[PDB]
Design a protein around this motif. Structure first.
Motif, PDB file in Angstrom:
ATOM      1  N   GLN A   1       1.168  -1.384   0.370  1.00  0.00           N
ATOM      2  CA  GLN A   1       0.040   0.003  -0.259  1.00  0.00           C
ATOM      3  C   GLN A   1       1.069   1.594   0.279  1.00  0.00           C
ATOM      4  O   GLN A   1       2.475   0.604   0.927  1.00  0.00           O
ATOM      5  N   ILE A   2       0.056   2.606  -0.623  1.00  0.00           N
ATOM      6  CA  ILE A   2       1.180   3.204  -0.500  1.00  0.00           C
ATOM      7  C   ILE A   2       0.385   4.729   0.645  1.00  0.00           C
ATOM      8  O   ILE A   2       1.700   5.126   1.335  1.00  0.00           O
TER       9      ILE A   2
ATOM     10  N   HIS B   1      -3.836  21.407  -4.128  1.00  0.00           N
ATOM     11  CA  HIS B   1      -3.773  21.120  -6.046  1.00  0.00           C
ATOM     12  C   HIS B   1      -2.984  20.194  -5.938  1.00  0.00           C
ATOM     13  O   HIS B   1      -2.811  19.573  -7.049  1.00  0.00           O
ATOM     14  N   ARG B   2      -1.754  19.792  -5.318  1.00  0.00           N
ATOM     15  CA  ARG B   2      -0.414  18.389  -5.818  1.00  0.00           C
ATOM     16  C   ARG B   2      -1.748  17.160  -5.617  1.00  0.00           C
ATOM     17  O   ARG B   2      -0.261  16.346  -5.847  1.00  0.00           O
ATOM     18  N   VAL B   3      -2.177  17.328  -4.517  1.00  0.00           N
ATOM     19  CA  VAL B   3      -2.707  15.930  -3.846  1.00  0.00           C
ATOM     20  C   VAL B   3      -3.556  15.925  -5.090  1.00  0.00           C
ATOM     21  O   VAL B   3      -5.164  16.415  -4.543  1.00  0.00           O
ATOM     22  N   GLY B   4      -3.275  15.057  -6.359  1.00  0.00           N
ATOM     23  CA  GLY B   4      -4.525  14.818  -6.538  1.00  0.00           C
ATOM     24  C   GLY B   4      -5.724  14.641  -6.767  1.00  0.00           C
ATOM     25  O   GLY B   4      -6.512  13.882  -7.255  1.00  0.00           O
TER      26      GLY B   4
ATOM     27  N   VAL C   1       5.453   5.557   3.979  1.00  0.00           N
ATOM     28  CA  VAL C   1       5.691   3.781   3.767  1.00  0.00           C
ATOM     29  C   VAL C   1       6.843   5.112   2.569  1.00  0.00           C
ATOM     30  O   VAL C   1       7.129   6.339   2.900  1.00  0.00           O
ATOM     31  N   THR C   2       8.772   5.051   3.007  1.00  0.00           N
ATOM     32  CA  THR C   2       9.613   5.828   2.175  1.00  0.00           C
ATOM     33  C   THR C   2      10.030   6.236   0.758  1.00  0.00           C
ATOM     34  O   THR C   2       8.945   5.471   0.219  1.00  0.00           O
TER      35      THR C   2
ATOM     36  N   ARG D   1       2.998  15.560   0.540  1.00  0.00           N
ATOM     37  CA  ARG D   1       1.995  15.007  -0.131  1.00  0.00           C
ATOM     38  C   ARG D   1       1.355  13.606   0.487  1.00  0.00           C
ATOM     39  O   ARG D   1       0.661  13.324  -0.420  1.00  0.00           O
ATOM     40  N   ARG D   2       2.075  12.969   0.600  1.00  0.00           N
ATOM     41  CA  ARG D   2       2.140  11.033   1.162  1.00  0.00           C
ATOM     42  C   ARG D   2       1.205  11.269   2.480  1.00  0.00           C
ATOM     43  O   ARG D   2       1.790  11.934   3.239  1.00  0.00           O
ATOM     44  N   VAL D   3      -0.240  10.218   2.408  1.00  0.00           N
ATOM     45  CA  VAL D   3      -0.365  10.476   3.408  1.00  0.00           C
ATOM     46  C   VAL D   3       0.040   9.328   4.161  1.00  0.00           C
ATOM     47  O   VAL D   3       0.723   8.340   4.100  1.00  0.00           O
ATOM     48  N   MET D   4      -0.054   9.681   5.492  1.00  0.00           N
ATOM     49  CA  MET D   4       0.707   9.018   6.801  1.00  0.00           C
ATOM     50  C   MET D   4      -0.117   9.157   7.761  1.00  0.00           C
ATOM     51  O   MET D   4      -1.380   9.688   8.264  1.00  0.00           O
ATOM     52  N   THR D   5       0.052   8.139   9.084  1.00  0.00           N
ATOM     53  CA  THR D   5      -0.837   7.970   9.984  1.00  0.00           C
ATOM     54  C   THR D   5      -0.047   7.915  11.573  1.00  0.00           C
ATOM     55  O   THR D   5       1.239   7.779  11.943  1.00  0.00           O
ATOM     56  N   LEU D   6      -0.589   8.746  12.514  1.00  0.00           N
ATOM     57  CA  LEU D   6      -0.149   9.204  13.506  1.00  0.00           C
ATOM     58  C   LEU D   6      -0.638   8.291  14.219  1.00  0.00           C
ATOM     59  O   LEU D   6      -2.080   7.637  14.572  1.00  0.00           O
TER      60      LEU D   6
END
Ligand SMILES: [K+]
Ligand SMILES: [K+]
Ligand SMILES: [Mg+2]
Ligand SMILES: [Mg+2]
Ligand SMILES: [Mg+2]
Ligand SMILES: [Mg+2]
Ligand SMILES: [Mg+2]
Ligand SMILES: [Mg+2]
Ligand SMILES: [Mg+2]
Ligand SMILES: [Mg+2]
Ligand SMILES: [Mg+2]
Ligand SMILES: [Mg+2]
Ligand SMILES: [Mg+2]
Ligand SMILES: [Mg+2]
Ligand SMILES: [Mg+2]
Ligand SMILES: [Mg+2]
Ligand SMILES: [Mg+2]
Ligand SMILES: [Mg+2]
Ligand SMILES: [Mg+2]
Ligand SMILES: [Mg+2]
Ligand SMILES: [Mg+2]
Ligand SMILES: [Mg+2]
Ligand SMILES: [Mg+2]
Ligand SMILES: [Mg+2]
Ligand SMILES: [Mg+2]
Ligand SMILES: [Mg+2]
Ligand SMILES: [Mg+2]
Ligand SMILES: [Mg+2]
Ligand SMILES: [Mg+2]
Ligand SMILES: [Mg+2]
Ligand SMILES: [Mg+2]
Ligand SMILES: [Mg+2]
Ligand SMILES: [Mg+2]
Ligand SMILES: [Mg+2]
Ligand SMILES: [Mg+2]
Ligand SMILES: [Mg+2]
Ligand SMILES: [Mg+2]
Ligand code: NA
Ligand code: NA
Ligand code: NA
Ligand code: NA
Ligand code: NA
Ligand code: NA
Ligand code: NA
Ligand code: NA
Ligand code: NA
Ligand code: NA
Lengths: 220, 399
Positions: free
Chosen positions: B21-22, B171-174, B222-223, B337-342
């Motif tokens: 997954q991303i 605008h960049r998180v498409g 994810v790196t 722009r990458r979604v991450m979990t805290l």
RNA sequence: AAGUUUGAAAAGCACUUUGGAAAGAGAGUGAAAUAGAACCUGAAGUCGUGACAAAGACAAUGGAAGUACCUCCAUUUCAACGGCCAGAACCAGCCCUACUGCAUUAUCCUGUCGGGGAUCAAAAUCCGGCGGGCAACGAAGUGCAAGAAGGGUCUUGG
RNA sequence: UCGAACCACCUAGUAGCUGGUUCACAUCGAAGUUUCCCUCAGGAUAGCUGGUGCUAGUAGAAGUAUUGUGCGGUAAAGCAA
RNA sequence: UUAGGGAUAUGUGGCGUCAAAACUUAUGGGCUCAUUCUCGAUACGUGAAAAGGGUUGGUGGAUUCCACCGGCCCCGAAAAUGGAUGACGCU
RNA sequence: GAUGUGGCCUGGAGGUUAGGACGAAGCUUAUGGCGUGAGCCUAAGAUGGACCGGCCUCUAGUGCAGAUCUUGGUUGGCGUAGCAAAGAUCUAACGGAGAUAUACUCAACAUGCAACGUUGGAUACUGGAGCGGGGAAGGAUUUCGUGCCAACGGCACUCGUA
RNA sequence: UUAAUGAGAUUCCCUCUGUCCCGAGUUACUAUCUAGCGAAACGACAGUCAAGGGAACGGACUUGAAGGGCUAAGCGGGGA
RNA sequence: CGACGUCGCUUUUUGAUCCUUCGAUGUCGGCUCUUCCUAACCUAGCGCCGCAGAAGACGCUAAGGGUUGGAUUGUUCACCCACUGACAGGGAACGUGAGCUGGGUUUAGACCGUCGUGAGACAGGUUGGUUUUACCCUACUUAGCUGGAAAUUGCGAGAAAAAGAUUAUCCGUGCAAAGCGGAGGCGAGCGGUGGGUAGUACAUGGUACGCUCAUCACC
RNA sequence: GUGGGAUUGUGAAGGGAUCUCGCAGGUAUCGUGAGGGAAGUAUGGGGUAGUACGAGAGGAACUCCCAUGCCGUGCCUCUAGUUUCUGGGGUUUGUCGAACGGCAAGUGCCCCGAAGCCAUCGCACGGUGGUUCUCGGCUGAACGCCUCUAAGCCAGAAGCCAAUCCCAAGACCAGAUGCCCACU
RNA sequence: AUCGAAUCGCCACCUACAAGACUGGAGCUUGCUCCCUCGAAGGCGCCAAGUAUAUUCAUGAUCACAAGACA
């Protein structure tokens, strides 16, 4: 989980709900190797066998002797690639399945069919509880197989010390199963008592010559 | 009988394959303590960029005690999440099994686009039959039965939460289809968890309700990906001497004669980056409010200048932080722009460093394009003064 | 290196059709164009295609016994008839039965005296005498057996 | 093409050495030991084997006993021979 | 020790499963416990000594203990890919 | 290793018996039958087109799975390795079969791509120890014009030292 | 023994540096993907391991342990 | 710790043998890289000493982790400088040459010493002296597609499911209780989607909510 | 039964007959977690303390807490490196008649240079439970007494096992779901 | 809807549980005596719904997968 074709064909056929001839074995206080040998021979004879309560199988000797045996088995691994190495299963029912598999011609189709006829459970799951009277293997029971002075181990304790993480789950589930079963048994005591008294009075209601016939064959 | 040094790389992060997954997904949740109040344990955020801060240190015995330090920080934008479902888990001898799902009566378009490859050209029927059914009396009874089953058999309760990309007006998180994750409810009895979850249904949850300012968190992300990489970068092995026929950047010996095969412990070329990582003990330095509510985001008690968390010129490749956000000390895996979990911390939070109360004195907001030397646009204006183009603009104004 | 060895004659494919052409599709010649030009026959190996058989990973091949499905094969039978399948009867030969007599026992069997034993007292285990003897149940697991004629034969032939 | 070029021929040079040696099944079936040899990766020679038989088919037989009669100095024993 | 086929019976070796055979025979006697090297089940042969100490046997003395001698087990007993009474296992 | 065989097989010869255009030899086989076997024989060719089988005897260049065996052909690897020194081409028009090449719907993109020779223009290179202009040696028509693109010019061609 | 000379052999010093500490970034041409074109080497049969015996280091054998099929890019452990 | 005696173990030395390879298994060291062993140098525990403390000796469990930088030398060994908690010892075809490197060794050139009448020799010194091939299989590393439980087939039916006119003939709760609570059509109920309108809530363009008309379904 | 295909090679057109195959699943999420991998490891300083021990010379350690090696996983805010953004300047020879614009020197050369990549050259982060060894004990026989064991128990190593971390259903998940279809 | 199959014991009384060095219960004398539910059966099912005054079976011709199977 049946396919839609299987369900549709069964619906067309009008056949009833079927269950194969399956023997359910209660393996509590059974000797691991002897039960495995008996089950393997019966599987090669075509029997369909479900074994329950594999966590209460026994091995002769102290727990430490058999845990060290398991750890010796555990260190066997293909060094250059441990994936595809020997796969070491920690669950007691998995251990019994492996013991039976090593007592079968596992590299033939016949041995594979025999092994796929065996289902192993820890505890007694709800889908098995009500299917009929469970059986024992007298020649593989601890109370006739081990001199009672000797130490012995319960398979579930060794397994939980070598990596099995479902000991407490099975313990709580077995406690709940026994409590439910004992409530259901204390209830229906009146039904069993009614049937007993009914047979006792039937004796005084049937014809007399039949009573004498029962007497001579030990039933009255 | 040779000279000795440790092996290259960690065999516990194997295989170095592309992550499934991303999104960053927690593989485990903190140990559930029934003595505490029911609470959520996770939150999805978006990495915007990095800056640095100055604070004074409260650490007796240290040489920096009562002294200013500057810390790089990462800014992660945290628009509120929406709770759309409840799932219960029962414990079996073969592991956790989900009992069922209680869906909300109403879902966003953003949540429903997640079920489509081409939403705009689709029939858009997702959850329509479920809505028409659950609305009725048989549906109300089915929901009641699922909730009773949760009460009777569940040991674990989680909520289905999703992100709001419309509020993350980036605008960049498409992507426009919401990110979906299961968030575990910890604390209290199972009935209390179910009550909290039922209250949460169809509602918005803000990141400040899950996390507090001076605490630490774990980050699942994810790196950054690098495609195919050689052993020097991928594993850190030494480069070979200049004199080497047929190439230098490689492992000279990939194995002894026996075993007559290559072991899994030998460095090979392959995928590098795009791996999932869990990165514990990231201190939260600030939980900011959205700029449309509090525009003095980077203002502290020691720097009275009114400024937002966005650097001059914007975060490079990302833009403006328009929503609530989290300032994490240090760095986190993955690009902007990458979604991450805290996730609420899994390690013990009893060290002096992890308990320290953080007070920010300065937050750098200079340009991240090219050696930024102005904190604000007013500072740059007062350095330069009237330029030619401003004079032309005023000349147009007077006519 | 290399047979021109098409076919009896060249009768060596007019004409139509589409294609730039090579050619293709038709039509003609010829007994035969799988006889169309370095063209008789046209093998093996390899390849394409259609139909079918299936098939995990036991490299494949191979042996032996069956079975499922097929079979452009062979042979036989088709009515007071079969050479096909199967079941019971009898016979002969084999092979398992069921049924056991002769000899022997004595360091033995029994009764009673004496001792010796042991516990509350006995009896017993044990040892010497004496009188008798068959331990005779299916006596004893000791030596040798010489007892003719129910069930097996898809393990034979009728 | 060179510690003796190239071309044709003598020349299919010789090789106790290496490699190969094409149908069936039937009756039998070994030897690596002896002696001599510039002999030791080879031969001759006897033995072991096959094929022929010849001769009056129970004979002049025997990897075995027994009885009778000879031979022996190894095992053991001895150092008080 | 051998033409190619059946039946019957053996040899060596076996009779818990693998694997035919005690579906784990007896209405037989003893002995043995062993923790990372796995006790044992290894004819040929393919894992050992000098030396020593749990249990249960023997001989010879002293008033239960003294010495001595066996059986089985234990220690003595350290090597390099993960591994081998053939495997599982068996007490 | 020796020996036997009204034992098998092949090309020719002396004999003797047959067969063939109503189809010989050769070749094909889930094509059966016979033989312990070498093999023999039948069937079917929706194969072939003219010779030939059996038996006794005679005769020999008479039987193949392998010799880094000889010659011819094929073959997996494989649409793979690769066709990367010498900087480089772009544009329009013309020529050309080499196109603007289409079932329905469909305005054109998303259903004919990629490549050519000439002229004009642009851009660059050789840089006079020159991919300049002439000779020897060597070659011998490769020169020239027209035509033509089967093969050849390791891609292509409407072009060519073909 | 020798000035001069040396693509001869050796030691040290100054300068200098990616030789090294310890690697990083960029370019052209490749590899890579496409169109056209298109080989060779090699090829008993084939290819997952552990132990055991065995011509005393097995892909095949014994006993275990693995192994769903088909593919693209690499790589040099083994194919003695 | 251990004379003189005696019993082992190990294949990290060298010898002995000559079994495999002579139609060829690339040969020393270093470099690089991974793995294994323990007869333990450091790191963790623990006994014991002649053990006051500090420093140490010897032993036990323990191989999880670690075990350097340099001068001369082709070297392995060595031994010198220095750092360190420590600078332990071994195996993997004396691990590892289609991984490199090629200093040594080991052709042809050449010089010396010794030997030889000589051509030449040296187990002695010296200098100079081509390191070839992977696109196949497996292994390993990443990277795609895809069937499949009778591991492709049988129709060969086994739920870590429920609990009943034999799962049919209702839903909740409760212990598999005792009971207890709801459950031809029109209309009604309950809702899904559209109009009108009205606050409010939530992060504030977009959903939910109260009232009414419409349709839709299920009952 | 329904449908679609097809039989063997010597023309054409209609008939059967017989095989074979399809007849129920698609597609989109959230999860489970068996099995496999597996990782953290050292030093120093403060304080204990110049004290316990010791005639004296000398001379310790842990609760704690402050750093630092190494190793591991990342990151690019800063600082440093890198430039074919041939970005902006500058500068040499040649060159289009000159200025301009440039151009050639396979990126002419020089200075500065964003973005990106990147350095223990920079920055961040690296966790918890069992179970045993050796050994020390407890209770306690054999054997009056004794004894740590023989039957029970306790404490216990950087060891082993699991958690956390990485891959993950050929581990064939009757785990939960969205929507069509089929069944109904 | 292919489809003909191999399989031949049902259950709402087994379908709860534990112990085998002590099994129903007592007693004291501790291995004997006294009591009982006397310690060796899960319930049915096998052709009259129940033990009897009955009632259709053929020719499917003497074996053949039971020619049939919701007990
Ligand atoms: K027999
Ligand atoms: K191509
Ligand atoms: Mg492990
Ligand atoms: Mg990227
Ligand atoms: Mg080189
Ligand atoms: Mg020459
Ligand atoms: Mg010759
Ligand atoms: Mg030969
Ligand atoms: Mg013979
Ligand atoms: Mg003597
Ligand atoms: Mg058997
Ligand atoms: Mg027995
Ligand atoms: Mg055996
Ligand atoms: Mg021969
Ligand atoms: Mg001839
Ligand atoms: Mg010849
Ligand atoms: Mg041959
Ligand atoms: Mg290519
Ligand atoms: Mg130029
Ligand atoms: Mg010139
Ligand atoms: Mg060409
Ligand atoms: Mg010189
Ligand atoms: Mg020179
Ligand atoms: Mg470098
Ligand atoms: Mg390549
Ligand atoms: Mg092997
Ligand atoms: Mg091989
Ligand atoms: Mg290789
Ligand atoms: Mg060889
Ligand atoms: Mg070689
Ligand atoms: Mg080799
Ligand atoms: Mg090499
Ligand atoms: Mg090299
Ligand atoms: Mg030179
Ligand atoms: Mg930069
Ligand atoms: Mg230029
Ligand atoms: Mg039938
Ligand atoms: Na004709
Ligand atoms: Na033999
Ligand atoms: Na016995
Ligand atoms: Na041939
Ligand atoms: Na190219
Ligand atoms: Na490959
Ligand atoms: Na001389
Ligand atoms: Na695991
Ligand atoms: Na910089
Ligand atoms: Na610079």
């Amino acid at each position: 989980f049946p396919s839609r074709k299987d369900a549709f064909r069964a619906q067309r056929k009008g056949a009833k709900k079927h269950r194969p001839e399956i023997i359910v074995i209660d393996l509590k206080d059974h000797v691991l190797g002897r039960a495995a040998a008996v089950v393997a021979k019966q599987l090669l004879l075509g029997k369909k066998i479900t074994v329950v309560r594999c966590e209460q199988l026994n091995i002769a000797g102290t727990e430490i002797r058999n845990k060290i045996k398991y750890l010796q088995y555990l260190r066997k691994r293909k060094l250059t690639n441990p994936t595809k190495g020997p796969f070491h299963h920690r669950a007691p029912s998995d251990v019994f399945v492996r013991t039976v598999r090593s007592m079968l011609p596992r590299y033939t189709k016949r041995g594979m069919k025999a092994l796929n006829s065996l289902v192993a459970y820890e505890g007694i799951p709800p889908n098995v509880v009500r299917t009929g009277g469970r059986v024992v293997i007298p020649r593989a029971q601890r109370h006739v197989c081990y001199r009672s002075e000797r130490p012995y181990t319960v398979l579930g304790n060794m397994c939980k010390h070598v990596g099995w993480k479902y000991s407490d789950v099975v313990a709580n589930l077995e406690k709940a199963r026994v409590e439910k079963a004992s409530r259901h048994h204390e209830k229906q005591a009146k039904l069993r008592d009614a049937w007993k008294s009914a047979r006792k009075e039937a004796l005084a209601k049937m014809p007399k010559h039949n009573v004498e016939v029962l007497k001579k064959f030990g039933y009255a | 009988c040779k000279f000795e040094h440790p092996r290259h790389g960690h065999l516990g992060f194997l295989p170095r394959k592309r992550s499934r997954q991303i999104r960053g997904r927690a593989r485990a949740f903190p140990k559930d303590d029934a003595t505490q109040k029911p609470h959520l344990t996770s939150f999805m955020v978006f990495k915007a960029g990095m800056t640095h801060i100055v604070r004074d240190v409260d650490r007796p015995g240290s040489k920096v005690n009562k002294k200013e330090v500057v810390e790089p920080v990462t800014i992660l934008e945290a628009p509120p999440m929406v709770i759309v479902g409840i799932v219960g888990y029962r414990q079996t001898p073969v592991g956790l099994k989900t009992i069922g799902t209680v869906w909300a009566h109403h879902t966003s378009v953003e949540f429903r686009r997640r079920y489509y490859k081409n939403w705009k050209q689709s029939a858009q029927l997702a959850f329509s039959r479920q809505k028409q059914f659950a609305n009725t009396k048989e549906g109300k009874v089915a929901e009641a039965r699922t909730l009773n089953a949760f009460a009777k058999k569940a040991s674990v309760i989680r909520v289905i939460a999703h992100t709001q990309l419309r509020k993350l007006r980036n605008h960049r998180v498409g992507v426009k289809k919401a990110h979906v994750q299961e968030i575990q409810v910890n604390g209290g009895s199972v009935a209390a968890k179910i009550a909290l979850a039922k209250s949460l249904l169809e509602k918005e949850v803000r990141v400040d309700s899950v996390f507090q300012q001076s605490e630490a968190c774990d980050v699942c992300s994810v790196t950054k990906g690098h495609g195919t990489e050689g052993v020097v970068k991928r594993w850190g092995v030494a480069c070979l001497p200049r004199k080497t026929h047929r190439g230098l950047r490689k492992v000279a010996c990939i194995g002894a004669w026996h075993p007559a095969r290559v072991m899994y412990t030998v460095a090979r070329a392959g995928q590098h980056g795009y791996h999932h990582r869990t990165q514990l003990n990231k201190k939260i330095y600030q939980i900011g409010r959205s700029v449309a509510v509090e525009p003095n985001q980077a203002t502290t008690t020691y720097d009275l200048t009114a400024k937002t968390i966005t650097p001059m010129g914007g975060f490079v490749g990302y833009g403006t932080v328009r929503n609530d956000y989290v300032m994490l000390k240090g760095s986190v895996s993955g690009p902007r722009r990458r979604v991450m979990t805290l996730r609420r911390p899994m390690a013990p939070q009893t060290s002096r460093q992890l308990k320290e109360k953080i007070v920010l004195k300065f937050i750098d907001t200079s340009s991240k394009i090219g050696h930024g030397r102005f904190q604000t646009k007013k500072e740059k204006n007062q350095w330069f003064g009237p330029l030619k183009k401003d004079r032309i603009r005023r000349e147009e104004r007077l006519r």
